[PDB]
């Protein structure tokens, strides 16, 4: 019921901001803040009003709210929006990140600003629609239309048409690397539906009847690779992640909040929801390749993070290290491991968003991007580097932050299922420390005479500090007290694991 409205407010707000662009220029900032407030209101209403602590073994079909509507009846394509417990965590996270995106874009007036915000709400609404998606075509359409408006963001707002490096390399690799694999998973969807159409005799694009379709061995394996390729180019996996640092280092850091904190979520959401239950034996065969790619991703991202000299590419290469833990979590037979991935995933978004906001904040203070050029700014800034120290501290497994409990319950479940690949995996924490300290010492520890421009520094406004203070206190409560959201996700995680166990 609430789901059609909850995916449509982003699109309605873009229309109204661009409508009132003719009326005024200070309107869309204040319009956008209220519209994202309504998005979190409906999302938090579903958290509180709904039975978040529901039955742990109520089957694979279980939803607090559900919407159905005929869209293309010839294939049974329907607007099958349906919200689960873990999907509701995703919706509340993106509503909060949308508030941060529209708050960081405050006091940013240009030649056109309504165009920026209709695009801003369009891309955030696309991610919400992926998170509420049970029909395969609706899932794919939303997956691919959140991908078009970021291209305009990197192009027309990466820099205003002055340098050609903001389109022809950064934005173009971002677009092609995702869309080729999106078309791969579309033909994977179609091969799965056609083998189901031979089995039963109805053209259906719905998840519940495609869940248990009879397929011979050696056939569903190729479709599982087809799903995983599109789910491995969106979250950074080892062979195909070259788009991520270019995308984050060129887009404005509000666009980078969208590009890191929430676009990385949807691929592991799809690995939990759409790839694991549909292909149980194929995923059981593919598991060790996934573990090898996971350990390679953690070690690889940390080394590339240590070796880099700038900051946006630095945090962009932390992200590929973080997601390796999540991939190994998903491809195991443990309930605790999956519940560790969820808390690690929410904390991943919350620990990347603050760093990107602050890295963009530091650049507009000093007008210099290279990290090794500055140094010793602690005597000049009064609140930026202290808050930045805790966010770099929250990146690695420091307890009292959500990242520690996240990565570390994965390791418990991972050692429960398989010893040797887990005992390799744990060493990324040592490597997490070295790139964390490298960031901290090269940027803030030292003498302010490392740069001439490090001798005249501005002040920090109240609202940026307010939205940084909220994230640090929110992230500490998730580290100390993670029970409420684990009780929320228990049943959804449990039935996925029980199906992955029982179907093999």
């Amino acid at each position: 019921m609430l789901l059609p409205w909850l995916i449509l407010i982003p699109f309605i707000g873009g229309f109204l901001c661009w409508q009132t662009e003719r009326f005024g220029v200070k309107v869309p900032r204040w319009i956008a803040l209220i519209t994202m407030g309504l998005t979190l209101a409906l999302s938090l209403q579903l958290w509180l009003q709904g039975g978040y602590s529901l039955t742990q073994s109520a089957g694979i079909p279980q939803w607090q709210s559900e919407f159905d509507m005929p869209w293309i009846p010839r294939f049974g394509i329907s607007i099958h929006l349906a919200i689960d417990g873990l999907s509701l965590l995703m919706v509340v996270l993106t509503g909060l990140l949308g508030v941060l995106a529209v708050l960081c874009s405050w006091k940013e007036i240009e030649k056109y600003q309504g165009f920026f915000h209709l695009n801003l709400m369009w891309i955030l609404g696309g991610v919400i629609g992926v998170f509420l998606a049970i029909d395969m075509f609706l899932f794919f359409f939303f997956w691919e239309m959140m991908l078009v408006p970021m291209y305009f963001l990197i192009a027309l707002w990466g820099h205003k048409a002055s340098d050609g490096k903001t389109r022809i390399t950064a934005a173009t690799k971002f677009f092609i690397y995702t869309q080729a694999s999106g078309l791969v998973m579309l033909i994977a969807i179609l091969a799965l539906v056609f083998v189901h159409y031979n089995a039963t005799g109805v053209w259906t694009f719905n998840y519940e009847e495609l869940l248990n379709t009879p397929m011979s061995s050696g056939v569903e394996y190729l479709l599982m690779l087809g799903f995983f390729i599109a789910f491995a180019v969106k979250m950074p996996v080892v062979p195909l992640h070259g788009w991520l640092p270019d995308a984050h280092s060129q887009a404005p850091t509000a666009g980078s909040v969208d590009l890191a904190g929430i676009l990385l979520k949807t691929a592991a959401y799809g690995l939990l929801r759409f790839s694991l239950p549909l292909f149980p034996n194929a995923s059981a065969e593919f598991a060790p390749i996934a573990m090898w790619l996971g350990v390679i991703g953690i070690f690889y991202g940390a080394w590339m993070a240590f070796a880099q000299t700038d900051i946006k590419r630095l945090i962009a290469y932390t992200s590929v290290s973080h997601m390796g833990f999540v991939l190994i979590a998903i491809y195991t037979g443990s309930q605790l491991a999956y519940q560790g991935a969820v808390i690690q995933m929410i904390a991943h978004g919350l620990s990347a968003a603050g760093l990107f906001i602050l890295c963009g904040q530091l650049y507009e203070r000093i007008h210099t991007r290279d990290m090794r050029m500055m140094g010793g700014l602690w005597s000049k800034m009064k609140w930026l580097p202290a808050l930045s120290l805790f966010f770099a501290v929250a990146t690695l497994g420091m307890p009292g932050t959500g990242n520690f409990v996240g990565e570390f319950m994965i390791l418990f479940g991972s050692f429960q299922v398989v010893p040797v690949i887990t005992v390799i995996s744990t060493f990324g924490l040592v490597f997490a420390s070295v790139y964390s300290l490298a960031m901290l010492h090269r940027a803030y520890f030292g003498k302010a005479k490392s740069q001439i421009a490090s001798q005249e520094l501005p002040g920090m406004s109240l609202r940026e500090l307010f939205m940084i203070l909220l994230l640090v206190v929110l992230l500490v409560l998730l580290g100390f007290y993670p029970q409420p959201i684990l009780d929320t996700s228990h049943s959804a995680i449990g039935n996925i694991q029980q199906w992955f166990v029982n179907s093999v």
Binding site: F408, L411, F415, Q416, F427, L429, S433, V434
Partner: protein
């Protein structure tokens, strides 16, 4: 260098922590004390890995 070296030790410390939860279930010290001999009627070879890596 101290930070790198102390986290190598902490990886070594958490290794035994995984093994103790896999073998004996509860991590409370006293409940561990009178749960350790109950669970160890048959196999003992893997406890040296837990304890050496705990050390």
């Amino acid at each position: 260098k101290a930070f790198v070296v102390t986290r190598v030790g902490d990886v070594f410390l958490a290794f035994a922590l995984f093994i103790l939860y896999n073998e004996l279930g509860t991590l409370n010290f006293r409940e561990m004390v009178e749960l350790a001999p109950a669970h160890f009627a048959d196999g003992n070879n893997m406890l040296m890995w837990a304890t050496l890596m705990l050390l």
